[PDB]
Amino acid sequence: SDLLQGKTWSVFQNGTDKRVVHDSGLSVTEMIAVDWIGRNLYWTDYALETIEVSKIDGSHRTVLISKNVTKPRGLALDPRMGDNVMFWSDWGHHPRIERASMDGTMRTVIVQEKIYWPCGLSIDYPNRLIYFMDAYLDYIEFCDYDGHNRRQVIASDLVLHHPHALTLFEDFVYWTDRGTRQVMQANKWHGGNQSVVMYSVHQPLGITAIHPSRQPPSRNPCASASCSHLCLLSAQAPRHYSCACPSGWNLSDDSVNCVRGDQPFLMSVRDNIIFGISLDPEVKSNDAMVPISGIQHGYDVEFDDSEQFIYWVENPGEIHRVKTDGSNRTVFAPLSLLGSSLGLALDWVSRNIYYTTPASRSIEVLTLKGDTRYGKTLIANDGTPLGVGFPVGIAVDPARGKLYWSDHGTDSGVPAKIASANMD
Amino acid sequence: XXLXXX
Amino acid sequence: RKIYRANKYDGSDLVAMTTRLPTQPSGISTVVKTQRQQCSNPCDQFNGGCSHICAPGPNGAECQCPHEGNW
Amino acid sequence: XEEXX
Amino acid sequence: XXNXX
Amino acid sequence: DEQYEVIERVDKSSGNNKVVLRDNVPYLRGLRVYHRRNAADSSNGCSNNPNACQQICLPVPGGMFSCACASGFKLSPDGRSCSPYNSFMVVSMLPAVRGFSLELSDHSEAMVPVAGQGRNVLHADVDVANGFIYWCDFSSSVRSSNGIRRIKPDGSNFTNVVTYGIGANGIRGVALDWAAGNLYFTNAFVYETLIEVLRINTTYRRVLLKVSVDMPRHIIVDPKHRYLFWADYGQKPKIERSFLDCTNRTVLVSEGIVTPRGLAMDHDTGYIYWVDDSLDLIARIHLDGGESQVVRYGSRYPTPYGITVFGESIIWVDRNLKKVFQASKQPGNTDPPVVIRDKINLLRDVTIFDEHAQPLSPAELNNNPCLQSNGGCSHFCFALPELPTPRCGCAFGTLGNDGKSCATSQEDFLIYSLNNSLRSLHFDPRDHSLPFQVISVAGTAIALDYDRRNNRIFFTQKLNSLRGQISYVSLYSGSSSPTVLLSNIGVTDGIAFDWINRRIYYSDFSNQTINSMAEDGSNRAVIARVSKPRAIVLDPCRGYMYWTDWGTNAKIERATLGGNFRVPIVNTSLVWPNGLALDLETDLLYWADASLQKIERSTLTGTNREVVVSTAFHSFGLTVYGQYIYWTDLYT
Amino acid sequence: GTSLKILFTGNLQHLEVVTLDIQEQKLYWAVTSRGVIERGNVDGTERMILVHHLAHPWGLVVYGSFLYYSDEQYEVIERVDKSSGNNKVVLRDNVPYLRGLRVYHRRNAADSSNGCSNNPNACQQICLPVPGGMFSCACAS
Amino acid sequence: VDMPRHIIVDPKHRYLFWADYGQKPKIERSFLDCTNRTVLVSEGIVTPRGLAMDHDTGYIYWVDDSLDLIA
Ligand SMILES: *[C@@H]1O[C@H](CO)[C@@H](O)[C@H](O[C@@H]2O[C@H](CO)[C@@H](O[C@@H]3O[C@H](CO[C@H]4O[C@H](CO)[C@@H](O)[C@H](O)[C@@H]4O)[C@@H](O)[C@H](O[C@H]4O[C@H](CO)[C@@H](O)[C@H](O)[C@@H]4O)[C@@H]3O)[C@H](O)[C@H]2NC(C)=O)[C@H]1NC(C)=O
Ligand SMILES: *[C@@H]1O[C@H](CO)[C@@H](O[C@@H]2O[C@H](CO)[C@@H](O[C@@H]3O[C@H](CO[C@H]4O[C@H](CO)[C@@H](O)[C@H](O)[C@@H]4O)[C@@H](O)[C@H](O[C@H]4O[C@H](CO)[C@@H](O)[C@H](O)[C@@H]4O)[C@@H]3O)[C@H](O)[C@H]2NC(C)=O)[C@H](O)[C@H]1NC(C)=O
Ligand SMILES: *[C@@H]1O[C@H](CO)[C@@H](O[C@@H]2O[C@H](CO)[C@@H](O[C@@H]3O[C@H](CO)[C@@H](O)[C@H](O)[C@@H]3O)[C@H](O)[C@H]2NC(C)=O)[C@H](O)[C@H]1NC(C)=O
Ligand SMILES: *[C@@H]1O[C@H](CO)[C@@H](O[C@@H]2O[C@H](CO)[C@@H](O)[C@H](O)[C@H]2NC(C)=O)[C@H](O)[C@H]1NC(C)=O
Ligand SMILES: *[C@@H]1O[C@H](CO)[C@@H](O[C@@H]2O[C@H](CO)[C@@H](O)[C@H](O)[C@H]2NC(C)=O)[C@H](O)[C@H]1NC(C)=O
Ligand SMILES: *[C@@H]1O[C@H](CO)[C@@H](O[C@@H]2O[C@H](CO)[C@@H](O)[C@H](O)[C@H]2NC(C)=O)[C@H](O)[C@H]1NC(C)=O
Ligand SMILES: *[C@@H]1O[C@H](CO)[C@@H](O[C@@H]2O[C@H](CO)[C@@H](O)[C@H](O)[C@H]2NC(C)=O)[C@H](O)[C@H]1NC(C)=O
Ligand SMILES: *[C@@H]1O[C@H](CO)[C@@H](O[C@@H]2O[C@H](CO)[C@@H](O)[C@H](O)[C@H]2NC(C)=O)[C@H](O)[C@H]1NC(C)=O
Ligand SMILES: *[C@@H]1O[C@H](CO)[C@@H](O)[C@H](O)[C@H]1NC(C)=O
Ligand SMILES: *[C@@H]1O[C@H](CO)[C@@H](O)[C@H](O)[C@H]1NC(C)=O
Ligand SMILES: *[C@@H]1O[C@H](CO)[C@@H](O)[C@H](O)[C@H]1NC(C)=O
Ligand SMILES: *[C@@H]1O[C@H](CO)[C@@H](O)[C@H](O)[C@H]1NC(C)=O
Ligand SMILES: [Ca+2]
Ligand SMILES: [Ca+2]
Ligand code: NI
């Protein structure tokens, strides 16, 4: 995952075929864990405070864990049908290591004593031990899947300064230290045979060991599943799988199919992200749509029901679009060369969009029907009070051909007012 | 170093 | 800029005795009230026979010459 | 020179 | 400055 | 609520029944509800009539619709099609160039706005016939952001028109002669100002006038009366007129004028309109220079920066008030000025893009002789006030006896190397015609000399720190690419041609030696071994040659063209003798010390040495012709 | 500092200095957002527009029969009659960066005595006049 | 592991109280020499930034900007 681009990528181990997996709706992706049996992809987002799952190609994204998830960092998986379990670390108030079956049904807390800034997780698959690390108490430890038989592999040792991420292979443990800016090697049972693997100019954040032994084969319980959209491995029942569907879909009573949720939801614009939240005040999930991350200066948002597109403006004077699923994030059209736009309003009946540019002090219209974008200025700042002083907001009534906008005043010109005009 | 990766 | 301690045999129980001190701490000793190991000094009897300066060597008093002059 | 703003 | 073409 | 950090839900009929959806949310902004808005339950004229309008459909009350066109297009009378604007004002400001309809009602952008990185527009002009807008960018820091650019009103075919030889102060005014296709502009330097002409879609460019005490800034042209006007706001503010070649200079306004930074022409009444931001007035004067008439005046006109005339009204911009005004052009009118657009920052100038403003029939332009095909003239045609035959201007060379063609000058003149090119310069200080078109060469040309018999210039040519070569080019009619005479040399700083023995001498700086050859590149010879030689001169009639050594033990030394009898002519008080020349008419030797900053003369053998000029800052080459010496200065 | 009161409110965006005619007991102020100078009685009545079509009034003073204003745009100091704002005159123009105005003139404290002047040395630190010829003593912060 | 931030002292009942708001938010109580520590509140507290006491009633008043609470 790229933090500056807000994208998840993949490549072959020979450096060929670099291709995008998730292009949108990531803010701070801490760790990724792929499910090599169920062909799913799990990750933790620090900013969104969620644990998310997708198909391995990125297609169907849903929010898996949201209740008491403050600062999720670590993430480990055991997709073997016997276990079918997931682990993650949270370093918010009351830090803890949490255990849950994939699909997030059988949620439990396994480690909450002598923990402060937990970071990084890895599984010893042969022994079913979860190794975890700590940046404040400066230790490396491991324990059973239930948190019992907790033991220390490095503790009360000055060589840990700020470890971040962790990896196992045979009887070695490797970890990345953000303090010393190194990746280390030690014996995974007593820490005793320590060395530097390499020195990094920048902080080394992520680590993984490429080897077939790190992904043991297992009989796939979801191979015979007929679930539409997502199918997640589960530790409960003999079936050992559960059907699920992305954000904005019902679960049907027939628990293999999903139908798109046509119910409304509130799009909450925030300075650097746009959230779709349920109109029900009791539902605090913030997953009515895939969030639009990477906004520069968010003021207003606008949508098209048809094609399920979400529109917003950006600083350089352009308008962007994305699906409610995230699938088509593109820059739609150049908006104005004379500064940034503030207001948005969409004429869904005639497929036009109206926007205000306080920099140019005008109200402009742009078409989104044809292949070629056509733009025109409707009202401009003339001498008279009837013109545009400093347009803030804009509302449209396509059925009656009326346009409404809120205007600040100008010196000796236009007064601060609520104004109406024909859409031409 | 503060824990927040950002 | 701290003072640490650890078990003398295996380096266990490593803790920091002080917070980060303002200047770098240099030089350390114990103050112990009980008398340390004591032995009979041969320089305590007739200066070990030496003319000037002496100290108890492994076998007996070793004579020594002052820092000034060639001796 | 007059206007370099 | 320094004497060259 | 952005301070309460909360999203809340209340009844639409009253603020009662408050419910919190979210709290502790930082940086809350807009809200909107994604729901099933149906395109069929709500219908309008545009939905009922798809693809009725060419570009934009906009619904109106009563279920009807009105077609609209993109910026720079307007509705055809059919009400369905779009055509490019024909009549609009071009308003220029520092950040952008924008176009407004000449009818206040239409607020549409009548032109694709020229803006973006690198725009510091000072002035604008229009070419209605070809559909182009010309503007000049100015940057006091970046040399790339200085010059004249043009674009179509619809935003296509962007082009850099003038980019070379712009002064420190940049282009200060541009005026297009739509009849002749000339583009007059003013090029301003630190202490002097040029007026130049460029013929559009040609490489022809020449200087008409150079002034130090005066400073033309804003220039306008009138092909109907065949005059050119410019405004001066220097130490002697004035409004000034000439013929279209800048010859017949005369001063229309000389008193009651301080800092005029705008001119305009009426083309129907023959008045000159100007704006004066230090006396806070708009005034007009006739072509013949009668008594100035005040159009607008008082405190309410603080900074009129630019003006234009359209029909019965004048249009001007105000920097302080940030408005574009329209008012009656007749003096003594007291109607308040009508505002077109306000709160526009850094207003500079205003111009009219209209067919009426740029006529092309001979009946309108009083039979301007440049219309037919450049008057039949080879380079520039300049129509005069009363002559029915155009004066022919020459960009480079001299005008032929036929009075319309141009050929290489047969006069005597200077030649000098300027980096990757060989330039020419008449001896006459006020003659601005180049004796020949500039020759482009590879690398950098360092030193040069002319062969009179074969009409060639031999010139040294630097390729890198260690690579140098000698080439030549012919000045005969037609052209010829520069031809290498001998490659595989170090850097060469000097060259001299013997017209008696037909040999070429040069100074290899890298190899620290003086060399010789035949004029055909054969028979190479070594004349002397000298540490850091720069210049060479020859006296074949007396069989003596002189050359300059700079650095340690710097001296001026003489030897035979054979190079046997080496004697030092001068060796007292020298450091950097870069320049050396010989006055054959008076038998005197001239040298330039670039470190001691002086030019000196002596007899041959260095008797009665004296300073010709002190504080010649950092000379490289020197030459003597007639009663004058000429030198190139590396510092200025 | 006592007996706070609101006299005039409404169209007063981008207010400028208030000034007072003591003789006539009228307040004058400029409103930049409307480019006008307004006048009103000290009791909060008879609000009315005196001078209009200004750009950015900044300084404002009334003396004798006249009102003086500096308009920061227009770069001008102008003088006009306090009665209905006629007979406009320019004192100075092309003044960059105009700000406040005030008229230096001799004022007789004897002809405008108040509580504090009638009772010197009454208060230890600060004496403040009060309507009706009274005075209220005050102390520093 | 703990982080006292805002500390108040009570000479009448002879106690120190401090807020934590750290990884394990709490309001603590101890003797005037920090001996004999006790937790008054650990539940429903995230970011206590200020303590107060009324000497005549012996109630600890605190604010919490993460719950938007004055309790
Ligand atoms: C200098 O070089 C620049 C480099 O780009 C050139 O731009 C420029 O050359 C050309 O100047 C001519 C001047 O006439 C321009 O031609 C004119 O184009 C007009 C626009 O044409 C468009 O719109 C019309 C609308 O009906 C449409 O029919 C066309 O298909 C096209 O989409 C056109 O209206 C105009 O026509 C007049 O002149 C014609 C001459 O044959 C008549 O047939 C016609 O009846 C009418 O009277 C004309 O063709 C040309 O645009 C321009 N080049 C470009 C690329 O813009 C050079 N000239 C100078 C000195 O500036
Ligand atoms: C996928 O899953 C989601 C979540 O369960 C479903 O969303 C619900 O859909 C139903 C049916 O459209 C919604 O019910 C309607 O709500 C309207 C307004 O909301 C009221 O109820 C909500 C929730 O309790 C309150 O927050 C709010 O204050 C309102 O009280 C009502 O106006 C509708 O009433 C109309 O229809 C009913 C019959 O359903 C009549 O009795 C009424 O007279 C009236 O005509 C209606 O009650 C419900 O609100 C949705 N919930 C959410 C979370 O939005 C999706 O429907 C489901 N997908 C599919 C396709 O099934
Ligand atoms: C880098 O490694 C990748 C992965 O090994 C190479 O890409 C492709 O890898 C497949 C692996 O099976 C190669 O075999 C092909 O498989 C398909 C499976 O359907 C089969 O139909 C083909 O007949 C073939 O066996 C495949 O050839 C290879 N693609 C290419 C372009 O050769 C990739 O080649 C590696 N790149 C480098 C630089 O070596
Ligand atoms: C999420 O957090 C809440 C609050 O801590 C949990 O609710 C508490 O659960 C414990 C049982 O572990 C109860 O004894 C407490 O009374 C609960 N407190 C409150 C205020 O409700 C809740 O269990 C957590 N839920 C999940 C999904 O883990
Ligand atoms: C580090 O590697 C060394 C060998 O390089 C291991 O050394 C032996 O460890 C045992 C068990 O602790 C000791 O009793 C032996 O005395 C060691 N042998 C030798 C030859 O020194 C060691 O196990 C590794 N780990 C540690 C903790 O040192
Ligand atoms: C949205 O994105 C998808 C995926 O990139 C686009 O679908 C592709 O379109 C191209 C161009 O026609 C085809 O060559 C690909 O095969 C398509 N891929 C898939 C997965 O269908 C789609 O066109 C985009 N839609 C819009 C309107 O933005
Ligand atoms: C001066 O001459 C040189 C060639 O001798 C011209 O060529 C450029 O030289 C610079 C280095 O000085 C290179 O970075 C460019 O790539 C060269 N190519 C061009 C065409 O730019 C150079 O343009 C000349 N400069 C002036 C101002 O005359
Ligand atoms: C500078 O030039 C003078 C000649 O003008 C040199 O003086 C001669 O030097 C030679 C050296 O062999 C003597 O034999 C001559 O008798 C000198 N003549 C005179 C008139 O002095 C002088 O050597 C040169 N060098 C410098 C730096 O003075
Ligand atoms: C002018 O623009 C058109 C359209 O982009 C292009 O086809 C044409 O080549 C351009 N002409 C020149 C001279 O650049
Ligand atoms: C312009 O110069 C001519 C000579 O070409 C001269 O006769 C005439 O007087 C000049 N014009 C004016 C108005 O003086
Ligand atoms: C310099 O002189 C040498 C002889 O010393 C000669 O062979 C060579 O060609 C000359 N040129 C260069 C640049 O080496
Ligand atoms: C004080 O400390 C003792 C010893 O730890 C403990 O038994 C007692 O309960 C504490 N509290 C009081 C009020 O004594
Ligand atoms: Ca640490
Ligand atoms: Ca002025
Ligand atoms: Ni102000």
UniProtKB/TrEMBL annotation, chain H:
Q: Which family does it belong to?
A: Belongs to the LDLR family.
Specify the superkingdom.
Answer: Eukaryota
Task: Give the subcellular location.
Answer: Apical cell membrane; Cell projection, Axon; Cell projection, Dendrite; Endosome lumen
**Per its record, how is this protein called by name?**
Low-density lipoprotein receptor-related protein 2
List the range of the whole protein covered here: 2190 to 2260 of 4660
Gene encoding the protein: Lrp2
Q: Where are the LDL-receptor class B repeats?
A: 14-57
